[PDB]
Amino acid sequence: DQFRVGLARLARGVRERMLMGSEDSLTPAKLVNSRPLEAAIREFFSRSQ
């Protein structure tokens, strides 16, 4: 579940990056910021009830 949340945030970031930048020179690596996913996981394992 937390993985799903983090992934959703990552996806929002992705669409956000797809709206910006050069439209011909986009790689998966350029669109994907992994930080929110890592954050969701870390939050689950550290500060979940």
């Binding site: 956000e16 910006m20 910021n33």
Partner: protein, 346 residues
């Protein structure tokens, strides 16, 4: 109830311009400013003052406040005097006044008509430390700038030129407000570049980069120490009200001691020190004790020079220095004898 919904409704009240309406308004604004210039030429007044009077009349009595740059406080009296100085012009001169008024009106209508674009742009800058509405307002400021700087002769749409100033305003806002401990914009750019670089490096390394690797990727002028210091300087504060167990249990602040105020032990130690020092000083003659006190600042809070103490007791500086020396000598003798002041030396 929801301020965003409310604002989107109020924005939905004003209809979107057609190319013709847009061009017309922009033209009226430009010619209006030129008219203000001409009125400044004729009247010999200040273009800013004239602009503020015209704007005042267009907006109404509701909004009449003092403008920072104006040498004169903008009150209805003064704006009436200036409006009467303007209305008392010949026809061909009084024309520019009407041009200016319609200019300001067109300005208002142009901004209000272009409030949607700001939203459409600002919705992409969320989650960066500023609320949606704050982003919208800053973008609105940018929009105002764009309106005042736009030139319709180039046949470019207003949206194109507005977007630049709007983005500029939002980004400036984020870089100026997002942090509790304010960081200069150029430093913010450096910090963000450092972040992007670290993120790229981890994306290629399959792990977080060391300071060294980051420095390498940052080019000349960057070593590991500079990366570390930048990251250190970029650290944001944490909340004192952060919960430790649950909301109803404890706060981070509860675990932080006050290091400022002296403890009862420290205060008592200082007190016993003053008392013991006075005790030891009483074993000297009044003049040597007083000289010592003046030279160490126990009297009026500051240490006097040998010349000041000497002039105070009416003797040579050499004399007073010798008295200080014999006083100190006696203190050392007595202290070696009683050992009552040793423990305070820590």
């Amino acid at each position: 109830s929801d301020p965003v919904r409310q604002y989107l409704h109020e924005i939905g009240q004003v209809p979107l311009l057609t190319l013709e309406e847009e061009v017309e308004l922009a033209r009226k604004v430009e010619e209006g400013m030129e008219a203000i210039k001409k009125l400044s030429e004729i009247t010999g007044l200040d273009p800013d003052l004239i602009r503020e009077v015209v704007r005042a009349k267009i907006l109404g009595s509701a909004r009449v406040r003092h403008i920072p740059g104006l040498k004169e406080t903008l009150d209805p009296k003064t704006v009436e005097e200036i409006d009467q100085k303007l209305k008392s012009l010949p026809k061909e001169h009084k024309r520019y006044l009407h041009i200016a008024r319609e200019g300001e009106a067109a300005r208002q209508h142009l901004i209000e008509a272009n409030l949607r674009l700001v939203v459409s742009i600002a919705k992409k800058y969320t989650g960066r430390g500023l609320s949606f509405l704050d982003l919208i307002q800053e973008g609105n400021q940018g929009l105002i700038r764009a309106v005042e700087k736009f030139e319709y002769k180039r046949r470019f749409k207003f949206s194109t030129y507005a977007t630049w100033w709007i983005r500029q305003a939002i980004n400036r806002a984020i870089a100026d407000q997002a942090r509790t401990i304010r960081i200069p914009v150029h430093m913010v750019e450096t910090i963000n570049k450092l972040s992007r670089t670290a993120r790229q490096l981890q994306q290629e390394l399959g792990r977080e980069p060391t300071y060294e690797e980051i420095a390498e990727a940052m080019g000349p002028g960057w070593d590991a120490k500079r990366v570390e210091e930048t990251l250190k300087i970029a650290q944001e504060p944490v909340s004192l009200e952060t919960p430790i167990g649950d909301e109803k249990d404890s706060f981070y602040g509860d675990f932080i001691p006050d290091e400022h105020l002296p403890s009862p032990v420290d205060a008592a130690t200082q007190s016993l020190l003053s008392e013991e020092l006075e005790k030891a000083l009483s074993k000297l003659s009044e003049r040597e004790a007083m000289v010592l006190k003046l030279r160490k600042g126990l009297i009026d809070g500051r240490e006097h020079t040998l010349e000041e103490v000497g002039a105070f007791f009416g003797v040579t500086r050499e004399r007073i220095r010798q008295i200080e020396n014999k006083a100190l000598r006696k203190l050392k003798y007595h202290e070696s004898r009683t050992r009552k002041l040793r423990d305070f030396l820590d």
